């Protein structure tokens, strides 16, 4: 028992982190096979970040300008190219620690672990979610760019995020590993503001199921509701609309607990309308929404890698 914000074991990714230096800028890169991926703004000066023409800036760079260091050993760069907002540095040595992996573009509401790194060295690991406004609420400082987010499937690391930018509001924006930003954000220091940070309803419900499994049940009530009635309430509180697809996804948690999905919606409805009244659920005083249904099943079962 017990339920914790849990990240994936980070060892497989630790073995892929390298340092990339272009001029005086030092970011992180991801070394898979004989390619190193990093944010293209490694080539920019702090001044350039206001309106960079990356294509023009790249013309002044050659293979030998990209210094790539795996631990204490330098890697030899034998080619480079730009794909969207990432750079692909071809090196002459395959990473011997490359795990089985894939690149995945995740959907808002999906969760992933982030390995925060600086100068190519891991600093810590935490769990995040792609927010409905396509930001993530991370923990990133100068030089953290190029740190990646990922999920693990027994033996396969699915990379879904690479970190690029911090918005003036302190939230974070980045790309998939093909270099395409999540949401409308760009690798420019400009006026880009995040949209509404709506709450991920299906994740809240999964977490309420997690609570029931782990002993917390004071919020269960004698009521039920319908998808349309609930969604009327979800809208007033800036919650994602709940769909039949979401209901279907919660099926297994409903079976394991014997609480119908729509009964749990009625519990969530009452919590939204009346608050927590100073109580807590799984050690939180708010409704947590960065656990997916699959996360809850995984932690409450013990899936390994």
> Is 273:284 a contact under the CB 8 Å cutoff?
no
Chain residues 154-193 in contact with a copy of itself, contact rule CB under 8 A: 166, 170-172
Q: Which helix or strand (DSSP H or E) is residue 300 part of?
A: helix 293-301
Beta-carbon contacts of 142 under 8 Å, excluding residues fewer than 6 positions away, are none
Q: In what order do the strands lie in the sheet with 35-39?
A: 73-75, 66-70, 17-22, 25-32, 35-39, 86-91, 77-83
Q: How far is the CB of 81 from a copy of itself (least distance, A)?
A: 29
Task: Return the residue nearest ligand R7Q (CB atom).
Answer: 145
Catalytic: 160? Answer: no
User: In the 8-state DSSP scheme, what is residue 249?
Assistant: H
Give the closest residue to 28 by CA, choosing from 121, 105, 93.
121
15's contact among a copy of itself, Cl ion, ligand R7Q, none, with CB below 5 to 8 A by partner kind, is a copy of itself
For ligand R7Q, the binding residue among 165, 200, 250, 281 (CB under 6 A) is 165
251 binds, among ligand R7Q, Cl ion, a copy of itself, none (CB under 5 to 8 A by kind): none
Which of the residues 16, 22, 44, 145 is marked catalytic? 145
Closest CA to 29 of 179, 196, 207: 179
CA distances from 5 to 19, 241, 295 (A): 29, 24, 10
Nearest to ligand R7Q of 53, 142 (CB atom): 142
Work out how close the CB of 144 gets to ligand R7Q at its nearest, in angstroms, rounded to a whole number: 5
Q: Is 246 annotated as catalytic?
A: no
Instruction: Quote the Cα angle for 231-236-238, to 5°.
Output: 85
Structure-token pair, residue 48: 């350039």
103 binds, among Cl ion, ligand R7Q, a copy of itself, none (CB under 5 to 8 A by kind): none
Contact status, residue 65 vs residue 23, Cβ threshold 8 Å: yes
Among residues 104, 125, 227, 297, the one that binds a copy of itself under rule CB under 8 A = 125
With CB under 6 A as the contact rule, the residue among 12, 80, 131, 163 that binds ligand R7Q is 163
- Interface with a copy of itself (CB under 8 A): 1-12, 14-15, 115-119, 121-126, 128, 137-144, 166, 170-172, 214-215, 275-276, 278, 280, 283-286, 299-305
Judged by the rule CB under 6 A, the positions of this chain that interact with ligand R7Q are 1, 140-142, 144-145, 163, 165-166
């Amino acid at each position: 028992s017990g339920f914790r914000k849990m990240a994936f074991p980070s060892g497989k990714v630790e073995g892929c982190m390298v340092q990339v230096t272009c001029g005086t800028t030092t970011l992180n890169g991801l070394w898979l096979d004989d390619v190193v991926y990093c944010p293209r703004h490694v080539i920019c000066t702090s001044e350039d970040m206001l309106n960079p023409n990356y294509e023009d800036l790249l013309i002044r760079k050659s293979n030998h300008n990209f210094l790539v260091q795996a631990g204490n050993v330098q890697l030899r760069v034998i080619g480079h190219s730009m794909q969207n907002c990432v750079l692909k540095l071809k090196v002459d040595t395959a990473n011997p620690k490359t795990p089985k992996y894939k690149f995945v573009r995740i959907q808002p509401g999906q969760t992933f672990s982030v390995l925060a790194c600086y100068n190519g060295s891991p600093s810590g690991v935490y769990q995040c979610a792609m927010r409905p406004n396509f930001t993530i609420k991370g923990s990133f400082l100068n030089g953290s760019c190029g740190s990646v987010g990922f999920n693990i499937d027994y033996d396969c690391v699915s990379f879904c995020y690479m970190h690029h930018m911090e918005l003036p509001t302190g939230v974070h924006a980045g790309t998939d590993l093909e270099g395409n930003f999540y949401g409308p954000f760009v690798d420019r220091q400009t006026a880009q503001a995040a949209g509404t940070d709506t709450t991920i309803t299906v994740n809240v419900l999964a977490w309420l199921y997690a609570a029931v499994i782990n002993g917390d049940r004071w919020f269960l009530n004698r009521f039920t509701t319908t998808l349309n009635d609930f969604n009327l309430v979800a809208m007033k509180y800036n919650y994602e609309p709940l769909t039949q697809d979401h209901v279907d996804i919660l099926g297994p948690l409903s079976a394991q607990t014997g609480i119908a999905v729509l009964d749990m919606c009625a519990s969530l409805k009452e919590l939204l309308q009346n608050g927590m009244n100073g109580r807590t659920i799984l050690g939180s005083a708010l409704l947590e929404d960065e656990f997916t249904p699959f996360d809850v099943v995984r932690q409450c079962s013990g899936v390994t890698f």
